[PDB]
Nucleic acid binder design. Structure first.
Ligand SMILES: [Mg+2]
Ligand SMILES: [Mg+2]
Ligand SMILES: [Mg+2]
Ligand SMILES: [Mg+2]
Ligand SMILES: [Mg+2]
Ligand SMILES: [Mg+2]
Ligand SMILES: [Mg+2]
Ligand SMILES: [Mg+2]
Ligand SMILES: [Mg+2]
Ligand SMILES: [Mg+2]
Ligand SMILES: [Mg+2]
Ligand SMILES: [Mg+2]
Ligand SMILES: [Mg+2]
Ligand SMILES: [Mg+2]
Ligand SMILES: [Mg+2]
Ligand SMILES: [Mg+2]
Ligand SMILES: [Mg+2]
Ligand SMILES: [Mg+2]
Ligand SMILES: [Mg+2]
Ligand SMILES: [Mg+2]
Ligand SMILES: [Mg+2]
Ligand SMILES: [Mg+2]
Ligand SMILES: [Mg+2]
Ligand SMILES: [Mg+2]
Ligand SMILES: [Mg+2]
Ligand SMILES: [Mg+2]
Ligand SMILES: [Mg+2]
Ligand SMILES: [Mg+2]
Ligand SMILES: [Mg+2]
Ligand SMILES: [Mg+2]
Ligand SMILES: [Mg+2]
Ligand SMILES: [Mg+2]
Ligand SMILES: [Mg+2]
Ligand SMILES: [Mg+2]
Lengths: 121, 52, 233, 252
RNA sequence: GAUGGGGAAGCUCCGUUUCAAAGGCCUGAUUUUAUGCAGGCCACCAUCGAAAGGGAAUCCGGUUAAGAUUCCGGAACCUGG
RNA sequence: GCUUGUGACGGCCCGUGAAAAUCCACAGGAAGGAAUAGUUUUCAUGCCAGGUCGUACUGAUAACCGCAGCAGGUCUCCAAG
RNA sequence: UUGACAUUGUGAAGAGACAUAGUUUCUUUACUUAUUCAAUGAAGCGGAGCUGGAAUUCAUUUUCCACGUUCUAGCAUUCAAGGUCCCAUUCGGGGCUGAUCCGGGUU
């Protein structure tokens, strides 16, 4: 017999087999626990006077919230730590490097009632 | 243009939204006439090969 | 025929895209290939001194075949064979009262370069096979000259790998016989005869002949057709 | 003293060429199978101004012998070529303004442009507005061909070396006075930063061999040796004569 | 401005597609089964660089001590699924 | 009328006045697809979702640079009788 | 910049000495693989052959060229239609030819 028969003049790097890692030992002995559970996410309530008003008038719960956390993580954690339904979650960074969440509950819930059953007023 | 029905992006002749009708008139004519004269060249130069 | 049509394409400058063809003559090989090829070329464009080039003259496939046939009946122990032998003398001998001599005199091919060399110097080898590969050629270049002087019959043979097979290594550089079972003493003299005829007998004259010089074939034809017409009107 | 202007140009800092707007490099077709055995047709699809060039480019597109697609070359338009014109490139092409042929394939007195110095270098001789070369003879055995470039220099090249029939377009561009500083200003604005020019004789010595003195004056011969050194070569380098050229020039 | 490279005693300098074996998509193949191979293409060769260049889509009324084309009301629209 | 927008034109040039992401179209016809029922989401309506950082105010005869609440300097839009 | 030495090899003619055998040295002019420069998504190189045909045969071919594209601002892609052979005839699909042979020196 005789030779190959390449129709292209470019020689490309042969497509060779890539084994997946099967370690003889482990990364770190023990997985890190959840770095951002709901208790780390929603830090404490914000109870400024002008914040309080949003709660009476807007069905909104103002919280200081972990800087590391996004609107998804704020939303769910309010939902879970408080048994409530959230419409949408607006956020902003305070000028002292903390995050404020304007959490609006759905109309089924009554933020006022809900705020003095977390305990503040 | 991706929020608009395909009718907004054509007319209904060959090469709709692409070239402009008069231009397609030219394209057809010349295509025909040239494919025709191909047949002419073939049979003329064919006869060359039979009396030369 | 039916509603089927013959359309033939015209592939002739100015029309129809060229078709797919075999361009293997034109592929842009990996630099490493390019090198190992041009190294072979450069090796033969030059005039090569007589003491190399005496290689290249390899043993022929027939004679060789008959030599690998004989040399095979003389392989060295396998690891099992040895494990098995030992326990047949470890167990025996020491208790049966031998002299590590419930073992028979072994007859195997001698190998390893530094080994074989002393054998030749000691006139103990009776048939030596030199490879034709051996990339630092120097490991081996002095072997024909040696064997010649020690009056030892040798042959340059294709296959450092092939030598390797008959001795259980990947490669083996040289293989030699010094020993032989009388059932074989015979057709060894036969082998030493053709072999001595193709090499040792020729050596003194092979030594006078350079190598290489060879043109590539674009240049070869250039002057098979130049030196054709110029003389021949 | 300080490094003088003409040595500073070489580091190309503010001296690299202004290039943002240019069309692309002007070039013949690659010298492929088609062009060296037969010929291949293209169409000029546009002839167009190129920033800071004096002569218009012609965009000419061709079919691709080896793939279904178009390939567009950028040519320098020879005078008289036009949109829609067909362009033939190849050994077996015919002698018309616009086509590209190997100087071996064309009779003496042929007038061509953008000619290669070595076959395939995709064109190097006579590209500027108005210029051309003339074939002034061939020599078949060892196939060389001999031309006269625009400079007056006669030179020989491979007969395989290609060129394009006719002259380069835009001629006469230099018979019209620049008239004011502003038109040279815009002229160089699209080339490189070489305008305006301070006379070294108006500089101080730190700046230039010519600089300084209590009247402006070159102070020593302004004909500098070939073997002079950087910072020395300003003025008339290697000048073999000097003074107003009385009498007809024209290479003998 | 990284990278195969080439300089440099070296800190580093040159090159940016350059003398490099430079890479990923569409689905077919699976009905051990989850993604190995069976076609073909594509050879485009990093990346950073514009809060005045290019660029998917929101508006009016109301509201605060201090925010608003961002909140409230109402009414839209874009992108992905 | 004034400002701004936009059009169809005209003058000028040895000046002829960016790029890329991105979107659409056409040529092509691999393929797939109905009558006992198929093909169709570039037509309408319907469902879910849209993270991260900036967002206050000054912008100057006092929030900027000139040792300063300095007659200096520091890019721009709106513009009534 | 200029010379020498090293990188540095291969033929041929010509001069140079043991003093008109060839080891050696220079001068010319050849070679190509060192080195050097250009090109391209290393595509059609070199050598033969087919057919043509100018050519005139001094036995019969001794040769030399050509060996798919030029009124037109169309169209040219799915390993190619055709022909032919297989699979076991399903729909799919494969080989060969279409596109001659040889050498793997990308030019
Ligand atoms: Mg309420
Ligand atoms: Mg925000
Ligand atoms: Mg329409
Ligand atoms: Mg044995
Ligand atoms: Mg530049
Ligand atoms: Mg200037
Ligand atoms: Mg001046
Ligand atoms: Mg001057
Ligand atoms: Mg002065
Ligand atoms: Mg001076
Ligand atoms: Mg001086
Ligand atoms: Mg002076
Ligand atoms: Mg003066
Ligand atoms: Mg760098
Ligand atoms: Mg960027
Ligand atoms: Mg921007
Ligand atoms: Mg912008
Ligand atoms: Mg408002
Ligand atoms: Mg408020
Ligand atoms: Mg405000
Ligand atoms: Mg709203
Ligand atoms: Mg609504
Ligand atoms: Mg949608
Ligand atoms: Mg204005
Ligand atoms: Mg214009
Ligand atoms: Mg469109
Ligand atoms: Mg098919
Ligand atoms: Mg829709
Ligand atoms: Mg994402
Ligand atoms: Mg504001
Ligand atoms: Mg103020
Ligand atoms: Mg200070
Ligand atoms: Mg001030
Ligand atoms: Mg090539």
């Amino acid at each position: 017999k005789a030779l190959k028969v390449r129709t292209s003049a470019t020689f490309r790097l042969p497509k060779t087999l890539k084994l997946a890692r099967a370690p003889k030992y482990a990364s770190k002995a023990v997985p890190h626990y959840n770095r951002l559970d709901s208790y780390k996410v929603i830090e404490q309530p914000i109870t400024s006077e002008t914040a309080m008003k949003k709660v009476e008038d807007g069905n909104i719960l103002v919280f200081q919230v972990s800087m590391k956390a996004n609107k998804y993580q704020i939303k769910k954690a309010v939902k879970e730590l408080y048994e409530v339904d959230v419409l949408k979650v607006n956020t902003l960074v305070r000028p002292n490097g903390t995050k404020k969440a304007y959490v609006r509950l759905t109309a089924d819930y009554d933020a006022l009632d809900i705020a003095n059953r977390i305990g503040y007023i | 243009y991706a929020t608009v029905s395909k009718t907004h992006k054509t007319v209904s002749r060959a090469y709709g939204g692409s070239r402009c009708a008069n231009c397609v008139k030219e394209r057809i004519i010349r295509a025909f006439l040239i494919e025709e004269q191909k047949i002419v060249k073939k049979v003329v130069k064919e006869q060359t090969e039979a009396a030369k | 025929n039916p509603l089927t049509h013959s359309t033939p394409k015209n592939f002739g400058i100015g029309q129809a895209v060229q078709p797919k063809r075999n361009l293997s003559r034109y592929v842009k090989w990996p630099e490493y290939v390019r090198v190992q090829r041009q190294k072979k070329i450069l090796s033969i464009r030059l005039k090569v001194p007589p003491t190399i080039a005496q290689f290249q003259y390899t043993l022929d496939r027939n004679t060789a075949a008959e030599t690998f046939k004989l040399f095979n009946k003389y392989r060295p122990e396998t690891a099992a064979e040895k494990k098995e032998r030992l326990t047949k003398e470890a167990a025996a001998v020491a208790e049966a009262k031998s002299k590590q001599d419930a073992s028979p005199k072994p007859y195997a091919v001698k190998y390893g370069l530094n080994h074989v060399v002393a054998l030749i110097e000691n006139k103990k080898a009776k048939l030596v096979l030199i490879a034709n590969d051996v990339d630092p050629i120097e490991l081996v270049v002095f072997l024909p000259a040696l064997c010649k002087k020690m009056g030892v019959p040798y042959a340059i043979v294709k296959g450092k790998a092939r030598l390797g097979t008959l001795v259980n290594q990947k490669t083996s550089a040289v293989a030699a016989l010094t020993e032989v079972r009388a059932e074989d003493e015979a057709a060894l003299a036969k082998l030493v005869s053709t072999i001595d005829a193709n090499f040792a007998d020729k050596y003194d004259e092979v030594k006078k002949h350079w190598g290489g010089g060879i043109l590539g074939n674009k240049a070869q034809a250039k002057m098979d057709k130049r030196a054709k017409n110029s003389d021949s009107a | 003293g300080r490094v003088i202007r003409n040595q500073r140009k070489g580091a190309g800092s503010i001296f690299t060429s202004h290039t943002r707007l240019r069309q692309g490099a002007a070039k013949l077709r690659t010298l492929d199978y088609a062009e060296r055995h037969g010929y291949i047709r293209g169409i000029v699809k546009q002839i167009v101004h190129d920033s800071g060039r004096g002569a218009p480019l012609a965009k000419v597109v061709f079919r691709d012998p080896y793939k279904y697609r178009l390939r567009e070359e950028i040519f320098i338009a020879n005078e008289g070529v036009h949109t829609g014109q067909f362009i033939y490139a190849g050994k077996k092409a015919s002698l018309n303004v616009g086509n590209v042929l190997p100087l071996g394939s064309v009779p003496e007195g042929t007038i061509v442009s953008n000619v290669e110095e070595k076959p395939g270098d995709r064109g190097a001789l006579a590209r500027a507005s108005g210029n051309y070369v003339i074939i002034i003879g061939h020599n078949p055995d060892e196939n060389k061909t001999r031309v006269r470039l625009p400079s007056g220099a006669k030179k020989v090249i491979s007969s395989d070396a290609r060129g394009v029939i006719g002259v380069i377009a835009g001629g006469g561009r230099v018979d019209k006075p620049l008239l004011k500083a502003g038109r040279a200003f815009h002229k160089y604005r699209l080339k490189r930063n070489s305008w305006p020019k301070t006379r070294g004789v108006a500089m101080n010595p730190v700046d230039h061999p010519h600089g300084g003195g209590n009247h402006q004056h070159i102070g020593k011969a302004s004909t500098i040796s070939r073997g002079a050194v950087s910072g020395q070569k300003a003025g008339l380098i290697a000048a073999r004569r000097t003074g107003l050229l009385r009498g007809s020039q024209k290479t003998q």
